[PDB]
């Protein structure tokens, strides 16, 4: 009641400004208080104002230290005491954040109370060395057929997701997370990827849609949403991926695996731009800070597959970059493209043309790719890359009097493209990815009518599920397609294809 | 008067520095009033420069200012009056009537800046507005509580589109509306005043179902920046205190970006990318985040945006493009083709468009429409060089349907009784799904293309077929 | 301490009695009693209709 | 129902301005002298504990 | 009733063939259908006179 609130204030007693250094604002304009004092002050230390505002100290100038406010201007006014928290930016890290939506400071914005986090570790921490990493050998399965075969993704690996604005960029990401529920349910902490979605500059209404969808898909119980919303201040937005990485480090360090999706670094860039411009530090090329490359690279190299002496763990990552109308040339895209090992390039034309979600796999690349891929899935998917490649070339020969060879290619290719359409927010399991691709590979879908490709797919799955759930279980458990299994599978495919 | 007396030190346009004395130093974002023969100059405190010398931005005009002029402190962000009676008042930037219905009757006053509501407050939207406009209903349905965004260049009569929206959605809707005009013409102002006096949305006898805040482009840039915030708080009073659902309307939000860019430059913040303010993101963010569907009220913003030279890749439109829920791009080209609505259908998408959510049937029909149109646009190039001879019979049928659909979309509006004379066709969403479905089924592909042009629903298309027939 | 002094006095000595029904009423929708289902009246009267319908039908083939 | 819920929230803000009234009373009273003396001796004690 | 109306309407299409100058078969049919569908949805959107006095 009134009593509980008053009792809370009473709990809030304790006073004395006994601090070796205090500060006094000289002038505060533009959220850049310039403080006289704070002689001792760690670099980028957290400082607490009289108005309880928190700040970092990017500029330590010789006579004054230009604090950058994380809080609202209105409260602050010149002269005010600036207490020295004495702790460089650190955020709680620990297992408590599973199924917790937290803001940048860590404060639950889903109001699930104080984090069950067992340490506070710094926002920026140097990345794993040469020997603290072992080569990738464990794939992660997104449940998106094209991604898993055409663009295979490892673990501790960072591939870009560079594509057109609000084309459900966030949707492409969210699909992966859904398949991670299945694996999450499974044991072995390597299979338990505790996903982290880093919502940067995203309005709280949008994130509310995310939160509810995640709750609907029960994803909250391994999901973490580090949230720096549109409203949240530009220091918070800037430090938001760095902060997020640290949360990931705890899981990674314990040897577990996890997937962190930084979405979108483009708005992070803008925030850094805002900071730099306000600190009068000259803005780099295309008016985006010069050492943005250094910041982004530092962030993206804290995602890695650690060595076995380092406890066999990883932090898979998937940064998202928003193209400026498909402009992949621009200082922030070019830099990021260089840093990333792989790219996924969604194509707008394809979206309109009904491949929704839309991916253009010509402009998707993996630079680690098939090194981590399901062995079964390797077997049934070399052909698919080549078939589609031919399909691209003969696409523009599809405008009259056509050679039989080209026309054959065209038929196989069109059916494949229809097959590779993905139904948003429905993931798939590898044990059901492989049969479908196998059919296409064996060209048994060449005969199947285009309209009936969609119908075929689900029907084939049900037919396999009733008739050949031995095959499905074999695929699931073996993880490799035995010649006997491929024989039986071919038979099954033929039988279903016949009907 | 106030001990908090400041003396002007430098009039450098809008930047006016004031020299408050000792032990007195207004907090950031305060409001200073300076007695002048120009009434009260309102100064928004935006920096302290130390030595009890603040640097403030002017809202009102800066001519005839004499240095060392006593500055009273009204304190805090400009506080307007809000109340039940605010409906049926046109209110200038400093919160004073500009429709000479005398002083606005204050129940409460509130500051024009108000903190964005937290994650907890937000309630997840799902309600579907139905404008009765075919393109909107079928190809990008709107949602109540939404943040509709009318991206377009000039010339597409952005105001005209909104006027149709007010006629349909506002009149239909029971809740109040707030029409806010940011940096818009006094020609437009006079037209809007007249038009809504006529439509009775403003009914001077009794109250109005709308309040108006006309901020015009002649108003100094500082006022142009902070008109938006003011309008929002009026909506908040309705939303919160009166527990209403508000149809907010703002016009044109490029003026808001532009205004902020100017005073960034004046503040000495060196211009950021493409000359836009470095605080563009946070200013946009503050506006959008404040608007939400709280448990006390659902507010549906419709924000006009001016896209300079139809480059929405320009950072000011592009930044806004993320921030808004239900984009529509009204392309000049499509307007010129004679299609009114001028919406480019393949460049107009809303968050609410999710398949089952908008109806699985609705989605599938609309998907078929989109594919048909997309094919048609691509095939125009083939027709252009190669000719129509290289299009197959199937392709030709898709093209014929698309040409019919393209002009099926064309329908008149009530606000182009003025432009033309034809009275608007309010065609319900359910009816549109059916009517478009019929076309795809080819049931009315026996109807001429021009009998789809600038008319209503399927029944009407049949009637106009009869009209052309005889 | 200072908090305690403020608290003791505040909690103990200050209690608000709930607002009048009128104040609540003002801040909520008031309620008023509507009237009628609708009262329409009989259609066309007299042999005006009768004559009109018989005669007007000349929609016979020519 | 809406104002019924609201009145509970509003009441705390009504009670808030009453704290401010009580603040004006505290700073007027020789609590202004005596409890400031208490703050002084307490601060002496804090600073002595350093 | 409503099914009778429409059955007789379609009968009337081939009756309207019998005499050229028909333009009020259409006025009768359109008018009865229009207001019929409107009153039918009016009846489907009927909220009986009831309010909470238990929950609220």
Which residues, including other chains, have CB under 8 Å from residue A292's CB and lie 6 or more apart?
A269, A272, A284, A331, A332, A335
Instruction: Tell me the C-alpha distance between B344 and B278, whole Å.
Output: 32
Q: Of B254, B320, B213, nearest to A165 (Cα)?
A: B320
Q: Does residue A328 sit in the same domain as residue A411?
A: no
Of D12, D15, D50, the CB nearest to A18: D50
C9 Cβ under 8 Å from any chain D Cβ: yes
Instruction: Tell me the C-alpha distance between A359 and A195, whole Å.
Output: 22
CATH of span B2-77? 2.40.10.170
- A167 domain residue, yes or no: yes
Q: Of A10, A13, A264, nearest to A160 (Cα)?
A: A264
For residue B371, the chain A residues in CB contact (below 8 A) are 353-354
- The single residue of A367, A412, A415, A452 carrying the catalytic annotation is A367
Q: Does residue A114 sit in the same domain as residue A67?
A: no
Helix (H, G, I), strand (E, B) or coil at B367: helix
Contact between D19 and C6 using a beta-carbon 8 Å cutoff: yes
Token code pair at residue A342: 């792989």
Give helix then strand counts, H and E, for chain E: 2, 0
For residue C62, the chain E residues in CB contact (below 8 A) are 20-21
Q: Does residue A136 sit in the same domain as residue A246?
A: yes
- A291 domain residue, yes or no: yes
Q: How would you class B34 by CB atoms within 10 Å of its CB: exposed for 0-12, middle for 13-18, buried for 19 or more?
A: buried
Please give the full DSSP string across B320-333, using - where no structure is assigned: HHHH-SEEEEE-HH
Which residues, including other chains, have CB under 8 Å from residue E10's CB and lie 6 or more apart?
none
Q: Exposure string (b/e) for B126-136, b if CB count within 10 Å is 16 or more?
A: eebbbbbbbbb
Q: Is the peptide bond before A357 cis (omega within 30 degrees of 0)?
A: yes
* Last-in-domain residue among A373, A407, A436: A373
* Last-in-domain residue among A373, A389, A420: A373
- With contact defined as beta carbons under 8 Å apart, do A79 and A36 qualify? no
Q: Does residue A267 sit in the same domain as residue A337?
A: yes
Instruction: Tell me the C-alpha distance between A461 and A18, whole Å.
Output: 71
Q: After which residues is chain C broken (C to N over 2.5 A)?
A: none
Helices D31-48 and D2-26 pack at an angle, to 10 degrees, of: 80
Kindly report the number of other CB atoms within 10 A of residue B377's CB atom.
14
Helices B315-323 and B280-290 pack at an angle, to 10 degrees, of: 30
Q: What does DSSP say about strands B177-184 and B246-249: parallel, antiparallel, or unpaired?
A: parallel
Q: How would you class A202 by CB atoms within 10 Å of its CB: exposed for 0-12, middle for 13-18, buried for 19 or more?
A: buried
- With contact defined as beta carbons under 8 Å apart, do B425 and B460 qualify? yes
Instruction: Tell me the C-alpha distance between B41 and A67, whole Å.
Output: 32
Tell me the residues of chain C between 7 and 36 that have a Cβ less than 8 Å away from chain B. 27-28
State the sign of the Cα–Cα–Cα–Cα dihedral A386, A388, A393, A394: positive
Query: Which of D4, D6, D13 is the best residue to mutate to test the B interface, defined by the most B CB atoms within 10 Å of its own CB?
Result: D6
For residue C16, the chain D residues in CB contact (below 8 A) are 11, 14-15, 18
Token code pair at residue A430: 């590898």
For residue E22, the chain C residues in CB contact (below 8 A) are 59
- With contact defined as beta carbons under 8 Å apart, do B348 and B161 qualify? no
Q: Does residue A415 sit in the same domain as residue A269?
A: no
Token look-up 């532009």 returns B258
Rounded to 5°, the CA angle B343-B348-B353 comes to: 130
- A195 domain residue, yes or no: yes
Looking at residue C18, the DSSP 8-state letter turns out to be: P
Please check if A166 is assigned to a binding site: yes
- A5 domain residue, yes or no: no
Computed on alpha carbons and rounded to an integer, the radius of gyration of chain B in Å comes to 25
Which residues of chain C are at the E interface, by a Cβ-Cβ cutoff of 8 Å? 56-62
Which residues, including other chains, have CB under 8 Å from residue A464's CB and lie 6 or more apart?
A432, A435, A471, A472, A492, A496
- With contact defined as beta carbons under 8 Å apart, do B158 and B306 qualify? yes
Tell me the residues of chain B between 329 and 358 that have a Cβ less than 8 Å away from chain A. 346, 351
Rounded to 5°, the CA angle A249-A251-A257 comes to: 105
Helix (H, G, I), strand (E, B) or coil at B229: helix
Instruction: Tell me the C-alpha distance between B430 and B445, whole Å.
Output: 21
Resolution in angstroms comes to 5.8
For residue A133, the cross-strand partners are A306
D27 Cβ under 8 Å from any chain C Cβ: no
Q: Does residue A80 sit in the same domain as residue A144?
A: no
Instruction: Tell me the C-alpha distance between B325 and B319, whole Å.
Output: 13
Instruction: Tell me the C-alpha distance between A260 and A247, whole Å.
Output: 10
Contact between A28 and B312 using a beta-carbon 8 Å cutoff: no
The backbone torsions φ and ψ at residue B90, rounded to the nearest 5 degrees and listed phi first, read -105, 135
Query: Which of E21, E26, E32 is the best residue to mutate to test the C interface, defined by the most C CB atoms within 10 Å of its own CB?
Result: E21
**CATH code for the domain of A476:** 1.20.150.20
Total of domains in chain A:
3
**CATH code for the domain of A25:** 2.40.30.20
Instruction: Tell me the C-alpha distance between B359 and B436, whole Å.
Output: 15
What is the span of the domain harbouring residue A66? Answer: 15-87
Q: Does residue A349 sit in the same domain as residue A478?
A: no
At the top level of CATH, which class does the domain B78-352 belong to?
alpha beta
- Three-state SS annotation for chain A: CHHHHHHHHHHCCCCCCCCCCCEEEEEEECCEEEEEECCCCCCCEEEEECCCCEEEEEEECCCCEEEEECCCCCCCCCCCEEEEEEEECEEEECHHHCCEEEECCCCECCCCCCCCCCEEEECCCCCCCCCCECCCCCCECCCCHHHHHHCCECCCCECCEEEECCCCHHHHHHHHHHHHHHHHHCCCCCCCECCEEEEEEECHHHHHHHHHHHHHCCCCCCCEEEEEECCCCHHHHHHHHHHHHHHHHHHHHCCCECEEEEECHHHHHHHHHHHHHHCCCCCCHHHCCCCHHHHHHHHHCCCCEECCCCCCCECEECCEEEECCCCCCCHHHHHHHHHCCCEEECCHHHHHCCCCCCCEEEEEECCCHHHCCCHHHHHCCHHHHHHHHHHHHCCCCCCCCCCHHHHHHHHHHHHHHHHCCCCCCCCCCHHHHHHHHHHHHCCCCCCCCCHHHHHHHHHHHHHHHHHCHHHHHHHHHHCCCCHHHHHHHHHHHHHHHHC
A18 Cβ under 8 Å from any chain D Cβ: yes
- With contact defined as beta carbons under 8 Å apart, do C7 and A4 qualify? no
- With contact defined as beta carbons under 8 Å apart, do A344 and A364 qualify? yes
Q: Does residue A60 sit in the same domain as residue A136?
A: no
Instruction: Tell me the C-alpha distance between B429 and B136, whole Å.
Output: 9
- With contact defined as beta carbons under 8 Å apart, do D48 and A16 qualify? no
- Choosing among 3.40.50.720, 3.20.20.60, 1.10.10.60, 1.10.1140.10, the CATH entry for B353-470 is 1.10.1140.10
- A4 domain residue, yes or no: no
For residue C27, the chain B residues in CB contact (below 8 A) are 241-242
Q: Does residue A178 sit in the same domain as residue A47?
A: no
Instruction: Tell me the C-alpha distance between B141 and B362, whole Å.
Output: 10
Domain with CATH 2.40.10.170 in chain B: 2-77
Q: Exposure string (b/e) for B234-261, b if CB count within 10 Å is 16 or more?
A: bbbbbbbbbbbbbbbbbbbbbbbbbbbb
Q: Of A42, A32, A30, A28, nearest to A80 (Cα)?
A: A28
Shortest CA gap E56–chain C (Å): 14
A2 Cβ under 8 Å from any chain D Cβ: yes
For residue B279, the chain A residues in CB contact (below 8 A) are 274
Kindly report the number of other CB atoms within 10 A of residue E25's CB atom.
15
Shortest CA gap E20–chain C (Å): 4
Shortest CA gap D2–chain C (Å): 8
Instruction: Tell me the C-alpha distance between A460 and A440, whole Å.
Output: 12
Q: Of B169, B162, B238, B166, nearest to B202 (Cα)?
A: B166
Contact between A28 and B47 using a beta-carbon 8 Å cutoff: yes
Rounded-to-10 torsion of CA A203, A209, A215, A220: -30
Query: Which of C23, C27, C30 is the best residue to mutate to test the B interface, defined by the most B CB atoms within 10 Å of its own CB?
Result: C27
Q: Of B308, B343, B318, B309, nearest to B413 (Cα)?
A: B343
Of B27, B323, B327, the CB nearest to A203: B323
The distance of Cα B446 from the centroid of its chain, to the nearest Å, equals 40
Token look-up 């009048």 returns C20
Token code pair at residue B79: 């506080």
Instruction: Tell me the C-alpha distance between A485 and A472, whole Å.
Output: 10
* Last-in-domain residue among A57, A87, A117: A87
Shortest CA gap D19–chain B (Å): 21
- A211 domain residue, yes or no: yes
Q: Does residue A394 sit in the same domain as residue A494?
A: yes
Of E20, E23, E24, the CB nearest to C62: E20
Helix (H, G, I), strand (E, B) or coil at E24: coil
Q: Does residue A295 sit in the same domain as residue A276?
A: yes
Task: Name the residue in chain D with its Cα closest to that of B244.
Answer: D2
Shortest CA gap C59–chain E (Å): 4
Kindly report the number of other CB atoms within 10 A of residue A188's CB atom.
9
Q: Exposure string (b/e) for B109-123, b if CB count within 10 Å is 16 or more?
A: ebbbbeebbebeebe
C5 Cβ under 8 Å from any chain D Cβ: yes
- A118 domain residue, yes or no: yes
Contact between D12 and A16 using a beta-carbon 8 Å cutoff: no
Token code pair at residue A252: 């990674």
Which residues, including other chains, have CB under 8 Å from residue B409's CB and lie 6 or more apart?
B134, B135, B339, B341, B345
Looking at residue B250, the DSSP 8-state letter turns out to be: B
Computed on alpha carbons and rounded to an integer, the radius of gyration of chain C in Å comes to 36
Domain with CATH 3.40.50.300 in chain B: 78-352
Instruction: Tell me the C-alpha distance between C55 and C61, whole Å.
Output: 15
Helix (H, G, I), strand (E, B) or coil at B297: coil
Binding residues of B for ATP, by number, are 152-159
Token look-up 């020789």 returns D30
Chain E contact partners (≥3 CB pairs within 8 A): C
Query: Between A and B, how many residue pairs show a Cβ–Cβ distance under 8 A?
Result: 135
Kindly report the number of other CB atoms within 10 A of residue A207's CB atom.
23
Shortest CA gap B193–chain D (Å): 34
Please give the full DSSP string across B114-170, using - where no structure is assigned: -PPPPTTT------EE--S-HHHHHHS-EETT-EEEEEE-TTS-HHHHHHHHIIIII
- A7 domain residue, yes or no: no
Instruction: Tell me the C-alpha distance between A27 and A10, whole Å.
Output: 33
- With contact defined as beta carbons under 8 Å apart, do B372 and B379 qualify? no
- Whether A contacts E, i.e. 3 or more CB pairs less than 8 A apart, is no
- Reported as type and span, the H/E element at residue B400 is helix B393-408
Looking at residue B79, the DSSP 8-state letter turns out to be: E
Q: Does residue A64 sit in the same domain as residue A79?
A: yes
Computed on alpha carbons and rounded to an integer, the radius of gyration of chain E in Å comes to 19
D34 Cβ under 8 Å from any chain A Cβ: no
């Amino acid at each position: 009641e009134v009593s509980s609130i008053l009792e809370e204030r009473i709990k809030g007693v304790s006073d004395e400004a006994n601090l070796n250094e205090t500060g006094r604002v000289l002038a505060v304009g533009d959220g850049i208080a310039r403080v006289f004092g704070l002689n001792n002050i760690q670099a980028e230390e957290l400082v607490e104002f009289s108005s309880g505002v928190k700040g970092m100290a990017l500029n330590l100038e010789p006579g004054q230290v230009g604090i950058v406010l994380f809080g609202s201007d209105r409260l602050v006014k010149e002269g005010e005491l600036v207490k020295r928290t004495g702790n460089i930016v650190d955020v709680p890290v620990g297992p408590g954040l599973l199924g917790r939506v937290v803001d940048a400071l860590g404060n639950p914005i889903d109001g699930k109370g104080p984090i069950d986090a067992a340490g506070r570790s710094r926002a920026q921490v140097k990345a794993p060395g040469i020997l603290p990493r072992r080569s990738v050998h464990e794939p992660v399965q997104t449940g998106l057929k094209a991604v898993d075969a055409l663009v295979p993704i490892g673990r501790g690996q960072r591939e870009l997701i560079i594509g057109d604005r609000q084309t459900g960029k966030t949707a492409v990401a969210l699909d992966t997370i859904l398949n991670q529920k299945r694996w999450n349910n499974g044991s072995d902490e390597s299979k338990k990827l505790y996903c982290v979605y880093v919502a940067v500059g995203q309005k709280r209404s949008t994130v509310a849609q995310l939160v509810q969808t995640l709750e609907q898909h029960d994803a909250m119980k391994y999901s973490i949403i580090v949230a720096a919303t549109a409203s949240e201040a530009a220091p918070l937005q800037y430090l938001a991926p760095f902060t997020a990485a640290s949360i990931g480090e705890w899981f990674r360090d314990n040897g577990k695996h996890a997937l962190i999706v930084y979405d979108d670094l483009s708005k992070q860039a803008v925030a850094y731009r805002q900071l730099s411009l306000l600190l009068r530090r000259p803005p780099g090329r295309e008016a985006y800070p010069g050492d943005v490359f250094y910041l982004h690279s530092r962030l993206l190299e804290r995602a890695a597959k650690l060595s076995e002496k380092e406890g066999s763990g990883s932090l898979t990552a998937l940064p998202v970059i928003e193209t400026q109308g498909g402009d992949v040339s621009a200082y922030i895209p070019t830099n990021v493209i260089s840093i990333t090992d792989g790219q996924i390039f969604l194509e707008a034309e394809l979206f309109y043309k009904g491949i929704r979600p839309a991916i253009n796999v010509g402009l998707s690349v993996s630079r680690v790719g098939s090194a981590a891929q399901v062995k079964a899935l390797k077997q049934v998917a070399g052909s698919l890359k080549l078939f589609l490649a031919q399909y691209r070339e003969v696409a523009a020969f599809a405008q009259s009097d056509l050679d039989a060879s080209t026309k054959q290619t065209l038929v196989r290719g069109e059916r494949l493209t229809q097959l590779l359409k993905q139904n948003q927010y429905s993931p798939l399991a590898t044990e059901e990815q492989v049969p479908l691709i196998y059919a296409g590979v064996n060209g048994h879908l060449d005969g199947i009518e285009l309209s009936r490709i969609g119908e075929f797919e689900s029907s084939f799955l049900s037919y396999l599920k009733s008739n050949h759930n031995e095959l499905l279980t074999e695929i699931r458990e073996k993880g490799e397609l035995s010649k006997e299994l491929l024989a039986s599978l071919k038979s099954a495919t033929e039988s279903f294809v016949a009907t | 008067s106030t001990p908090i007396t400041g003396k002007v030190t430098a009039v450098i346009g809008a930047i006016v520095d004031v020299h408050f004395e000792q032990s007195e130093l207004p907090a950031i974002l305060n409001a200073l009033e300076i007695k002048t023969p120009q009434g009260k100059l309102v100064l928004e405190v935006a920096q302290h420069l130390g030595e009890n010398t603040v640097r403030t931005i002017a809202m009102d005009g800066t001519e005839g200012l004499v240095r060392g002029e006593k500055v009273l402190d009204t304190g805090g962000p400009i506080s307007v009056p809000v109340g039940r009676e605010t409906l049926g008042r046109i209110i200038n930037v400093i919160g004073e009537p500009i429709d000479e219905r005398g002083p606005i009757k204050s129940k409460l006053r509130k500051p024009i800046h108000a903190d964005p509501p937290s994650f907890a407050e937000q309630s997840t939207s799902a309600e579907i507005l139905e404008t009765g406009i075919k393109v909107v209903d079928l190809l990008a349905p709107y949602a109540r509580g939404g943040k509709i965004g009318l991206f377009g260049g000039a010339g597409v009569g952005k105001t005209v589109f909104i006027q149709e929206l007010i006629n349909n959605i506002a009149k239909a809707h029971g809740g109040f509306s707030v029409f806010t005009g940011v940096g818009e013409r006094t020609r437009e102002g006079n037209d809007l005043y007249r038009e809504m006096k006529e439509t009775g949305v403003i009914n001077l006898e009794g109250e109005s179902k709308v309040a108006l805040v006309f901020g015009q482009m002649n108003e100094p840039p500082g006022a142009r920046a902070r008109v938006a915030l003011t309008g929002l708080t009026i909506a908040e009073y309705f939303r919160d205190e009166e527990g209403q659902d508000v149809l907010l309307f703002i016009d044109n939000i490029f003026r808001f970006t532009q205004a902020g860019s100017e005073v960034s430059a004046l503040l000495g913040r060196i211009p950021s990318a493409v000359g836009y303010q470095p605080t563009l993101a946070t200013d946009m963010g503050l506006l959008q985040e404040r608007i939400t569907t709280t448990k006390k009220g659902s507010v549906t913003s419709v924000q006009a945006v001016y896209v300079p030279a139809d480059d929405l890749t320009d950072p000011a439109p592009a930044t806004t493009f993320a921030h808004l829920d239900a984009t529509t791009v009204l392309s000049r080209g499509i307007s010129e083709l004679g299609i009114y609505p001028a919406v480019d259908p393949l460049d107009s998408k809303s968050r609410l468009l999710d398949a089952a959510v908008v109806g699985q049937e609705h989605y599938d029909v609309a998907s078929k429409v989109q594919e048909t149109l997309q094919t048609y646009k691509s095939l125009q190039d083939i027709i252009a060089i190669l000719g129509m001879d290289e299009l197959s019979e199937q392709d030709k049928l898709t093209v014929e349907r698309a040409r019919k659909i393209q002009r099926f979309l064309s329908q008149p509006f009530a606000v182009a009784e003025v432009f033309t004379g034809i009275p608007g066709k309010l065609v319900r969403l359910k009816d549109t799904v059916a009517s478009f479905k019929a076309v795809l089924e080819g049931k009315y592909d026996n109807i001429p293309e021009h009998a789809f042009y600038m008319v209503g629903g399927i029944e009407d298309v049949v009637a106009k077929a009869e009209k052309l027939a005889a | 301490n200072v908090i305690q002094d403020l608290y003791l006095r505040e909690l103990k000595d200050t209690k608000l009695a709930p607002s009048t029904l009128q104040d609540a009423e003002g801040n909520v929708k008031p309620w008023n009693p509507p009237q009628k289902p609708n009262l329409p009246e009989l259609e066309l009267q007299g042999p005006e209709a009768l004559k009109a319908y018989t005669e007007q039908n000349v929609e016979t083939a020519h | 129902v809406r104002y019924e819920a609201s009145l509970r929230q509003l009441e705390q803000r009504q009670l808030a301005k009453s704290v401010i009234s009580r603040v004006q009373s505290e700073l007027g009273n020789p609590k202004f002298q005596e409890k400031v003396l208490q703050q002084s001796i307490s601060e002496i004690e804090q600073l002595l504990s350093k | 009733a409503k099914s009778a109306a429409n059955k007789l309407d379609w009968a009337k299409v081939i009756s309207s063939l019998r005499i050229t100058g028909s333009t009020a078969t259409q006025l009768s049919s359109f008018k009865k259908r229009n207001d019929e569908a409107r009153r039918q949805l009016l009846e489907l959107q009927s909220q009986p006179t009831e309010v909470d006095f238990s929950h609220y």
